[PDB]
């Protein structure tokens, strides 16, 4: 009983002491003579329109030409970014949707929402129409994020404080990761697709191994719920998007905080976070209807992406790193370059 709690306290203090001992210097002081990137001027290129309600999520295709968006209108429009054309317009069953996923192969799409059911739609059929290929069920809470591992697997994170790994064919729940104490609000997949980090509402993030079940590392330091998580292209770091006007950068191989990106002029929460192709920049979406481009190596502002009349809800960067698409509650997506 109590002895277990005391042993847990000793384990925690040992962990924090070891982490403190492993700390010798800060990244900010390490990169003190690394020239600034200068002002980053951003201009809208395309202004994809056609939604009739708040946009809640989006995802870029593998070719970095096609994207998919969802809104409370009840639609899953698929846009061709180059010519602002619509390829498909999938009508949903329940309009309370807050998640999208585009398969890396490009054949399927996935959509979650408040109905606790993850629908998987097939795009390429001989009938020339999109039909619901599968309907995964089993979560007892609202779905928050879903990502495609392969054409036959999916990873979901919902509000029942658990994450799931589903096999599409059998429709089962092949793995279930648990250990959080609050709603899980975001999820990101490593480039090698063997590990993934989930950020919960208990002001924490965890690193899960897809093959196994337990969480190898737990990262804390935020003072509020985390609404966004994004990996670093190197695969040895990630960035969070918590609600207390602060985005922090965590490193996998030291279990330690590295840097925080905060300004006394910013008080609103962060909804989306995404790195760049190389990792020099970090784009974050705030509730000020703006988007901030933080110099990820030295924690300085490098530009502003104003132009939206409402909260920025989804943010994405193309695979080739040629453009950045932001979708807001104004029922508008914009393609900056």
């Amino acid at each position: 009983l109590d002895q277990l709690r005391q042993e847990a306290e000793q384990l925690k203090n040992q962990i924090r002491d070891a982490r403190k001992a492993c700390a010798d210097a800060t990244l900010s002081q390490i990169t003190n003579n690394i020239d600034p990137v200068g002002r980053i001027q951003m201009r809208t290129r395309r202004t994809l329109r056609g939604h009739l309600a708040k946009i809640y999520a989006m995802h870029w295709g593998t070719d970095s030409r096609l994207l998919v968006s969802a809104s409370q209108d009840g639609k899953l429009i698929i846009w061709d970014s180059y010519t602002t054309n619509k390829v498909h317009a999938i009508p949903l069953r329940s309009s309370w949707v807050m998640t999208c996923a585009y398969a890396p192969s490009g054949n399927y799409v996935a959509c979650g929402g408040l109905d606790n059911i993850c629908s998987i739609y097939n795009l390429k059929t001989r009938e020339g129409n999109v039909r619901v290929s599968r309907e995964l069920a089993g979560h007892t809470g609202y779905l928050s994020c879903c990502r495609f591992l392969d054409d036959n697997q999916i990873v979901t994170s919902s509000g029942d404080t658990t994450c799931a790994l589903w096999d599409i064919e059998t429709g089962q729940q092949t793995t279930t990761f648990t250990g959080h104490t609050g709603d899980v609000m975001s999820l990101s997949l490593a480039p090698d697709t063997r590990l993934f980090v989930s950020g919960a509402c208990d002001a924490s993030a965890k690193l899960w191994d897809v093959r196994e079940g337990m969480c190898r590392q737990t990262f804390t330091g935020h003072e509020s719920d985390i609404n966004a998580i994004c990996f670093f292209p190197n695969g040895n770091a990630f960035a969070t998007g918590s609600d207390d006007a602060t985005c922090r950068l965590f490193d996998l191989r030291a279990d330690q905080e590295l840097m925080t990106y905060s300004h006394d002029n910013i008080i609103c929460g962060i909804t989306s976070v995404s790195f760049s192709k190389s990792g020099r920049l970090l784009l974050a979406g705030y509730d000020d209807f703006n988007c901030n481009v933080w110099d990820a190596l030295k924690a300085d502002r490098a530009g502003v992406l104003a132009g939206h009349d409402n909260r920025v809800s989804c943010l994405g960067v193309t695979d080739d790193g040629m453009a950045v698409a932001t979708g807001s509650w104004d029922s508008f997506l914009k393609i900056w370059n």
Binding site: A25, A237, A254, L281, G321
Partner: peptide
Amino acid sequence: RIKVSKAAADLMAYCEAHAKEDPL
């Protein structure tokens, strides 16, 4: 764990290596 300086140097090296590859 590993030293923080090593991780910082690795991140900086990766960031500077792919410098002339992101149109962003």
